[PDB]
Amino acid sequence: HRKPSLLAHPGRLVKSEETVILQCWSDVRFEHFLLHREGKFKDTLHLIGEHHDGVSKANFSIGPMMQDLAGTYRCYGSVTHSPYQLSAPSDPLDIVITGLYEKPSLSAQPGPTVLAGESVTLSCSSRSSYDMYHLSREGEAHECRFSAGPKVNGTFQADFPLGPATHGGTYRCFGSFRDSPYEWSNSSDPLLVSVI
Numbered sequence: 001h002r003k004p005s006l007l008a009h010p011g012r013l014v015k016s017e018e019t020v021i022l023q024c025w026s027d028v029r030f031e032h033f034l035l036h037r038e039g040k041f042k043d044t045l046h047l048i049g050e051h052h053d054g055v056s057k058a059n060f061s062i063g064p065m066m067q068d069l070a071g072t073y074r075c076y077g078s079v080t081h082s083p084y085q086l087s088a089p090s091d092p093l094d095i096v097i098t099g100l101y102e103k104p105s106l107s108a109q110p111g112p113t114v115l116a117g118e119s120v121t122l123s124c125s126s127r128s129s130y131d132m133y134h135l136s137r138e139g140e141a142h143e144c145r146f147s148a149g150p151k152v153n154g155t156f157q158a159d160f161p162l163g164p165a166t167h168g169g170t171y172r173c174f175g176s177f178r179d180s181p182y183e184w185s186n187s188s189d190p191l192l193v194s195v196i
Helices: none
Strands: 005-007 013-015 020-026 032-036 044-048 056-062 071-078 093-098 105-108 119-125 132-136 144-147 159-164 169-176 191-193
Touching: 005 071, 020 032, 020 071, 020 093, 032 056, 044 056, 056 071, 105 169, 105 191, 119 132, 119 169, 119 191, 144 159
Parallel strands: 013 093
Antiparallel strands: 005 020, 020 056, 032 044, 032 071, 071 093, 105 119, 119 159, 132 144, 132 169, 169 191
């Protein structure tokens, strides 16, 4: 037993039709790994786990990405001196399909370039009824997200207060509905928040 690691080399969010690798590694010399998703089309993947030096690993390829592939992934593994047997559940990893709707309008109210120690904040508008927006800082494993405020005149937005401008960078923003929590919108245009 003992839960293995489940991550995705490029990243969690996958653009429409692209592909991601969901690698399963573990020191515990297994021989078979099993991959499992949720959402609509609940499915399981049976791949023979190799042993690329020391630690045992498996490499699943989520091909032409689609609405069905996106959901909550979990990895398992074992040895076939006993077939059925499965390791303890592995860490949940949500595979997202970016690119599927009109791009939101990300911007910084105080300004993309703000003096340090001066609280910065970025909002996401759009004319469509997105129930929530997401903010990618590109890189980090777990990102942020918040439901949106009703139509103010014609728009739908969500404010992501970042706070005292410290070591800025570049954010992106997506939108989604209460129904399909894994099917996002097309990524909004990149923005460089500067800190002089």
